[PDB]
Amino acid sequence: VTMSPESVVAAAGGGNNNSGYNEPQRFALVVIAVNHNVIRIMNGSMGFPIL
Amino acid sequence: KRRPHAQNHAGYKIKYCKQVPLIPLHGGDYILNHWETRGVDRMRIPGIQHA
């Protein structure tokens, strides 16, 4: 991922009153994936054959 | 005068002590039934998954 000029200028402080970026700002990256699974229902119990 | 009646024989009190099994009657609880056993997944393909 490539960052942004707004982010690199707001990383440091220097903003005026009610600007939000008057103080140093740091960011974190989060990644979420969604996948499939198979559930077996027999013998009064369940589980993942492939896990 | 009639002869008095009372216990005369001392009986047979076998020495030492005997045993009883002292086993739970049904045993339905305290024990699972090979299913819903926590920490293990019965519905799993054999370990050929890492093969």
Side-chain angles (χ1 to χ4, degrees), chain A residues 1-45 47-51, chain B residues 1-2 4-12 14 16-51:
Chain A
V1 55
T2 301
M3 272 325 278
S4 77
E6 311 316 301
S7 178
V8 308
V9 68
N16 49 356
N17 304 326
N18 263 354
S19 45
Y21 71 114
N22 187 19
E23 292 82 45
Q25 303 262 301
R26 74 211 50 71
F27 310 88
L29 178 65
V30 61
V31 183
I32 286 163
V34 180
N35 60 16
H36 284 130
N37 296 115
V38 171
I39 296 194
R40 184 172 316 278
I41 307 293
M42 61 79 71
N43 273 14
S45 180
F48 297 91
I50 316 297
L51 174 67
Chain B
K1 169 174 152 196
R2 322 267 297 276
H5 60 91
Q7 177 191 13
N8 50 5
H9 200 259
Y12 294 140
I14 278 164
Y16 315 121
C17 311
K18 74 172 184 302
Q19 294 290 321
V20 300
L22 193 149
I23 190 57
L25 183 138
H26 181 249
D29 57 75
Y30 294 104
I31 295 310
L32 278 299
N33 53 345
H34 184 45
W35 303 102
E36 79 263 16
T37 300
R38 62 179 64 89
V40 68
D41 168 59
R42 301 258 170 272
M43 294 287 136
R44 184 67 59 73
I45 301 299
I48 70 179
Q49 291 329 105
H50 87 286

